[PDB]
């Protein structure tokens, strides 16, 4: 029930996003790269990404 990434959401496109809202995007990413462990659990490979933020 991500509610927030709900199906509406999408109408973010009509709100014509800027630009910067979505470079602070990086820092959701940056939670999510670290989740991508999870990957890692496969013997390795999403953890490699991992690497990027360090």
């Known amino acids: 029930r991500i509610y927030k990434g709900v ?3 999408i109408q ?3 709100e014509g996003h800027p630009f ?4 602070e995007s990086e820092v959701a ?4 790269l ?3 462990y999870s ?6 490979v ?3 990404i991992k ?3 360090r």
């Open 7 to 9: 199906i509406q959401a």
């Open 12 to 14: 973010k496109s009509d």
């Open 20 to 23: 910067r809202a979505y470079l």
């Open 29 to 32: 990413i940056s939670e999510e």
């Open 34 to 36: 670290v989740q991508k």
């Open 39 to 44: 990957n890692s659990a496969l013997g390795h």
């Open 46 to 48: 999403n953890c490699t």
């Open 51 to 53: 690497e990027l933020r």
